[PDB]
Amino acid sequence: PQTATKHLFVSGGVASSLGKGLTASSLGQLLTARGLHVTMQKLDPYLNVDPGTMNPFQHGEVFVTEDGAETDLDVGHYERFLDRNLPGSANVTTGQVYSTVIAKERRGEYLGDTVQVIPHITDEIKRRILAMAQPDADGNRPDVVITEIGGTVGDIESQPFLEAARQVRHYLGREDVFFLHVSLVPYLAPSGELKTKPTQHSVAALRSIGITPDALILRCDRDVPEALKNKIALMCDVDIDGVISTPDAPSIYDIPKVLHREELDAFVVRRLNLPFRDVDWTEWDDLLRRVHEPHETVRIALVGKYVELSDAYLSVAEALRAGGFKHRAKVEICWVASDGCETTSGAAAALGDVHGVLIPGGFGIRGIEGKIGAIAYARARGLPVLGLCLGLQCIVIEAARSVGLTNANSAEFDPDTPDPVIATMGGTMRLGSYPAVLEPDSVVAQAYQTTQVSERHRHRYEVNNAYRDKIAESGLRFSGTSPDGHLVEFVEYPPDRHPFVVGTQAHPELKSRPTRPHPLFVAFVGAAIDYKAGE
Amino acid sequence: PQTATKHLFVSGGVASSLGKGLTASSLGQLLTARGLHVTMQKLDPYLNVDPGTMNPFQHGEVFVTEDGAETDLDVGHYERFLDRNLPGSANVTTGQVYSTVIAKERRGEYLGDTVQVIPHITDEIKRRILAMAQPDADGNRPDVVITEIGGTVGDIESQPFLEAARQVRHYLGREDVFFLHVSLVPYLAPSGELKTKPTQHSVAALRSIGITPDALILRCDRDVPEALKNKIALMCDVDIDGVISTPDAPSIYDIPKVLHREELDAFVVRRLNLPFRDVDWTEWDDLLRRVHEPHETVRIALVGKYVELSDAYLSVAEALRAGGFKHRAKVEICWVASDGCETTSGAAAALGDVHGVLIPGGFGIRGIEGKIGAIAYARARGLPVLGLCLGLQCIVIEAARSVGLTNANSAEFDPDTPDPVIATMGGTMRLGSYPAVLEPDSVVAQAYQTTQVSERHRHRYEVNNAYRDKIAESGLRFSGTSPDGHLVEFVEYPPDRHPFVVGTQAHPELKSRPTRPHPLFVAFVGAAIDYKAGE
Amino acid sequence: PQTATKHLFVSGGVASSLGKGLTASSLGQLLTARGLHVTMQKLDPYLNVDPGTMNPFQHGEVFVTEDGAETDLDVGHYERFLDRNLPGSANVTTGQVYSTVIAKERRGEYLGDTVQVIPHITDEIKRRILAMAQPDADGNRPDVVITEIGGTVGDIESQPFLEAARQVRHYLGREDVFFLHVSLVPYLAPSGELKTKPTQHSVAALRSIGITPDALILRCDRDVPEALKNKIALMCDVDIDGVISTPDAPSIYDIPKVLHREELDAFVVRRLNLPFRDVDWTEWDDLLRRVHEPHETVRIALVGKYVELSDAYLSVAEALRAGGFKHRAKVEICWVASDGCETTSGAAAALGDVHGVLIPGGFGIRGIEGKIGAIAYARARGLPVLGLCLGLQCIVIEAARSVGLTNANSAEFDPDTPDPVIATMGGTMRLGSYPAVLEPDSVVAQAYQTTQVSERHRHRYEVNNAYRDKIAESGLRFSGTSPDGHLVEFVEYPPDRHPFVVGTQAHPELKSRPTRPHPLFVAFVGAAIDYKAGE
Ligand SMILES: O=c1ccn([C@@H]2O[C@H](COP(=O)(O)OP(=O)(O)OP(=O)(O)O)[C@@H](O)[C@H]2O)c(=O)[nH]1
Ligand SMILES: O=c1ccn([C@@H]2O[C@H](COP(=O)(O)OP(=O)(O)OP(=O)(O)O)[C@@H](O)[C@H]2O)c(=O)[nH]1
Ligand SMILES: O=c1ccn([C@@H]2O[C@H](COP(=O)(O)OP(=O)(O)OP(=O)(O)O)[C@@H](O)[C@H]2O)c(=O)[nH]1
Ligand SMILES: O=C(Cc1ccc(F)cc1)Nc1nc(-c2ccccn2)cs1
Ligand SMILES: O=C(Cc1ccc(F)cc1)Nc1nc(-c2ccccn2)cs1
Ligand SMILES: O=C(Cc1ccc(F)cc1)Nc1nc(-c2ccccn2)cs1
Ligand SMILES: NC(=O)CC[C@H](N)C(=O)O
Ligand SMILES: NC(=O)CC[C@H](N)C(=O)O
Ligand SMILES: NC(=O)CC[C@H](N)C(=O)O
Ligand SMILES: [Mg+2]
Ligand SMILES: [Mg+2]
Ligand SMILES: [Mg+2]
After folding, report:
1. d(CA B42, CA B75)
2. What is the C-alpha to C-alpha distance for residues A502 and A499, in angstroms, rounded to an integer?
3. What is the number of the ligand 5 atom nearest to the C-alpha of B217?
4. Annotation marks residue C220 as catalytic
5. How far is the CA of B230 from the centre of ligand 11 (A)?
6. Which of B444, B472, C112, C305 suits C531 as a labelling partner, its CA being 20 to 30 A distant?
């Protein structure tokens, strides 16, 4: 029968950006390929109640769950490597834990006590941790919960989450709880040596708060010598079979192979006494084939904020790559700044060499004149376009500006526009999954191969239903709607007007996975391949 | 001209209950008697937004300011030793600072940053500290702000307030900022020696977070030897003129004399470069005369929760003592449990030896049948009664039960009573100061020697105006009201019915001070003296 | 007139091997080129009383001072960058401080107290620090003492030296004392970013023991962005003019140019209120010319332990390079393992491509059969040879084996040899400087251009005077001796036997400096150039 649910606490030392979330995700994939029901959670030491207030260009994209919670992008890495939907519960923050305890205090639920960091804040954290172990919506209890602790050991803001994890270790005992600590091994070029001292000091910090690590992930630019691993194991009081050399992999999809080569998963399974079974590599070997052996290559313009890669579009880039993997193409992303595309000559300079244009949306942007101006170019050049949320809105304002409505805009972007073709139906923010119905033999229905779909939403403006008939004279079809028809969900040109120009109000990159590409990106990358081949 | 405003941070080590608030108050009195405009503030490390949720029998009375804020009782010690009204600003807590920062975050006021303990929580604390330095409602800038830091150095919950105080020291520099650290010197009886090691470890803890103490208050049951003070000064890196031996004083009013004997005030004034002037002892010498040389002695029953002293009635006890000081009486307080007074024989056993009965109110009590039953006894015995808030309500329900209304109660205490003579006019909670007008030649007007008064309120039930005429047939007069007459504020029997039986809806113990006793307690202790003398 | 002597404490964070000793040396050179009398000292946190017990291949060479003390090699970096002789006082260790205090205790010099880490160990450290400030053998008080603190902040063994430095800062005050902290900024390649978190945690550790850094040396593989320096200055409470970006330089002689470009020396001089004068670059500009613009290039075999660079021969390699600089040659060092040179074919394979053979000595070696075998080859091939200490001993045993004495050896290396031509005159270990007199028109006298010299010694075996006449028949001349003639100090072949083959019992690499090459290395590199050119 099933064991008690095990808890694995991934902590971090020396610095952030060591790839700790991708390490935890890869371990989740390894434990899943042995046949265990893994689930994952992140604790964020910052006070924002959710990232919906933070700028995504500075702090990365907001991820959205099926239930509509807004979360850190590591929940996106977990969903991609697990191929599992995660609840909003999967992202705790300090901002939420304090607000919850203070609200319980104002209602008198602590019966006249003084409220304190210990026990009340740590009890709320420990409650939110052990909540993840509860039977799912189908009654399946998970085998392992992998809680990743944000921040760095010895940040002030981390000290309640580490204390709650220590208390979970005290309550359940070592048979049920494992601590994995991620650390940096730096290389010093002038003297040609790897240094273990930062890992020693970081494990000493972790021991001074009452945690003993069961294993060490040694992040390094080169493979750590065995003599150094022995020195660490002796200095850190860690089993040598738990000292895992983790050099920089070529792609993120190789990290499971690195960890399996070191046998970290076997060490965890044995030390947690989990049911041992072999890793089924079949699916991930097929992914790594498509990743490493592309037959062709295509260039896609991502019409973003700036001419450089941004974590604001991490999920979009991953979804484009997965679309490529479906075709066994490479996808190379041309990061194109919107503002250079406001003039038609600037647009031609930015886009003329690419094979498709992706218009992403989000929050924290201005300057959609250059987005429309890239659409206006792409249509004349005959390039395929995929528009996501704001992308659809720019497509529909282009079409408004293609018929008579030369001053048309969104009410969001020109509050004085005489033609607000995009308008609040601040209105309701639609969040999470909503259903939609699709026109039969639409280009969208040919992509999805179904008439009914659902997608994840995060927007509050809509297509103004007063202009549907006007802008249909552009040629554009409203090939998908809410089941009542009240809301436009998808727009397309007919294939004889342009081979593939599609918009959606949703964020389909959120439902994409590397081993299960989303239909619209498979369709769009198809269209880009066909343009390149015919061009 | 006036200097920059100085900041004095009183911190605490080894344990709570060392009398740190009374020490800070006594230093405030000493600096005031030199002629400086002192003001005081407390920081509370607990998460309750205010103490109005805590039980006062477990955690002490809720103090109330003129503006109606609810605060820790140390604000009461400050008001009593300064004889100054303090704003609600004078009690910060963690509960308030977090709720404020989280609310600013939800409104987007941090412009897309991650919100962190440093800088944002420490900036909110530092802002609330330096707020105290601002010019008052008359434009007077204070000379010194004495912020007392709650908790113990090395409590987790204190670490943001100490960090904010360190940053204030960094911003203003040593010329403007002083740190006073209070510590315990224990005595070990089996080996007959005072131990300095706890003070060494507490100053080491304070130094490990970047604070250097300017002076040490050594709390002890006996006067610390000079050799030990020299050892501490050498071990702690403190000026020997800052090592202050502070043995347990006979009364709290002696603590200024202890501190002045050690010359702590001169050391502070010199080290802060404040305008040096001599202490005017005249008023406090008169207080210490009345305190130490009572001509007579009277017993007052405080009809409370239990037969032992409670911090739930600390201000009531201080106001009774100040009433005594006005007469040069001693007051001895008989702590009488209400529940023994429910039966008339039990009431007679509890009260028969005393000379007056005080019925206090508050929150966190049940059992007012025994309160009425003590009033019913006191009236038959001819003892004077002072009723505060709930005390008035019990007086008026006694009178309802004296005429025909034998099942009368408050709606608070029997929700099914057929005669709710006390009722919500949960209704409005009245908080802070409100004005009232008094009947000419009422016993209240003879006490106050004015027809217009104000008092501090904290209640939400009222006398039901539907029963005024009925209960006036008890003999009771509604000798004071709101200026519109809508609310009963004071009730009394005529002097020929009982010599002094008075109730008020307010908490007059909050406006009392040791050098300025409140009129109603001077009147009540007068009546008790006259009963004793005539009895 | 002269100020009080300033104290500069260079500390280290995150890891060792950051080049902290070379940074302190380069700052010493900069302050010297302004005209200040700098002096330097190192504190070693290890318990060895001196490095003469440690293996040099594992822990680097033992340096030797004029007075014969044995010290860490950082004293060699100080001597090379200052061009100043340093006393044995310049290397404190924990091993010495404890042994000194325990010996004073056994003699009763603490008059019956308990002896403690504080005050007695920290008083001994503080005494040894302030000793460096005393007037020199000519009466000159130094302007600055630059004490470098070994180890890493937060090593247990460092905590007494940091406490002593804090007490020096307390005693002399900020006007006289400066703290420079060296830290690592790592680069993470997968995400392309520099991380400041290790520096934040290392400065927090330094602040938790009561030290505030005046400046930060940021060691990095690339130049740190100004935005990061501003973030560090804000997070660390350091003046932005003290945040010094210190990327990896091409050669160690460039480090003064890096530090002067950042204006660190001006910041120190100003913050210490030292007499400001401009840097005279003339000599160091001439050095950097010769370093960066070599006209030719020569290969020298260093016949050592292994085929890789070793810190066991750091001073030898520096002396060879300085010899090159005198000629404006490059010197490239062929690291040749002795054991491959035991066979004549192996010797020919190891050495045939080089232009000169250097035979170094020391302790911690065996296998001098291969050293003699490289000499035997070099003589037949006509390559010049310089033999240092053990090198001379191998030359003289080669010559013993060239005449009749085929089993001759040292008594150190074959205790049963029937011909101990090298013998203990364990005998006296000669340490430090001794004088020697040289044969007129010896090859040595032509190198030194004097008949009288002194050199630094560290050996206990000698040439057996019983074999002088026998081995002179090899052709070898005893071209220098002790002034009494009792000890052989130099040996050479006549120029017609070999153009340059010289041995010495001393370690002339210790007296070499980059701006003042030692005569024997200038002569030997000359001979190698002449062989290459004629060959
Ligand atoms: O300058 C000095 C002087 C002395 N020591 C002494 O050397 C000991 C070892 O100090 P290390 O810096 O070499 O640490 P480590 O070898 O154990 O790990 P790595 O970072 O190199 O990988 C330390 O305990 C210290 O006492 C130094 O490290 N540096
Ligand atoms: O049992 C022992 C053994 C040895 N020692 C050693 O004695 C030294 C002094 O330790 P103390 O306990 O006496 O501290 P103190 O005199 O400075 O201050 P007081 O609390 O007594 O007032 C300490 O540094 C410790 O090394 C003990 O204290 N106790
Ligand atoms: O995974 C997480 C989650 C949350 N946070 C929160 O982000 C804040 C900043 O944490 P950083 O890691 O980014 O430190 P830093 O920017 O100040 O310096 P660098 O090393 O990057 O150069 C921290 O205070 C933490 O609360 C993380 O760092 N990582
Ligand atoms: O390549 C990227 C940038 C990126 C980030 C997130 C993405 F979804 C797609 C790309 N990051 C990488 N991290 C590693 C790694 C991590 C841990 C252990 C070993 N190697 C290799 S590459
Ligand atoms: O007597 C009481 C109990 C009490 C509390 C609060 C009150 F308002 C009335 C009484 N407390 C005392 N603290 C000291 C003391 C304090 C500091 C330094 C020296 N002595 C003497 S007595
Ligand atoms: O090149 C070597 C190896 C070596 C060691 C000692 C020697 F004597 C000769 C060579 N070390 C170097 N350290 C730096 C450096 C140091 C500090 C700051 C900036 N750059 C450049 S190169
Ligand atoms: N989620 C998004 O892309 C938002 C797009 C646009 N700002 C809107 O609110 O409609
Ligand atoms: N402040 C009090 O004494 C409250 C008394 C009573 N519980 C009321 O609310 O009316
Ligand atoms: N200093 C050295 O080179 C020592 C060489 C040899 N071991 C000797 O003692 O004579
Ligand atoms: Mg090492
Ligand atoms: Mg003692
Ligand atoms: Mg960062």
Report:
1. 7
2. 10
3. 18
4. no
5. 14
6. C305
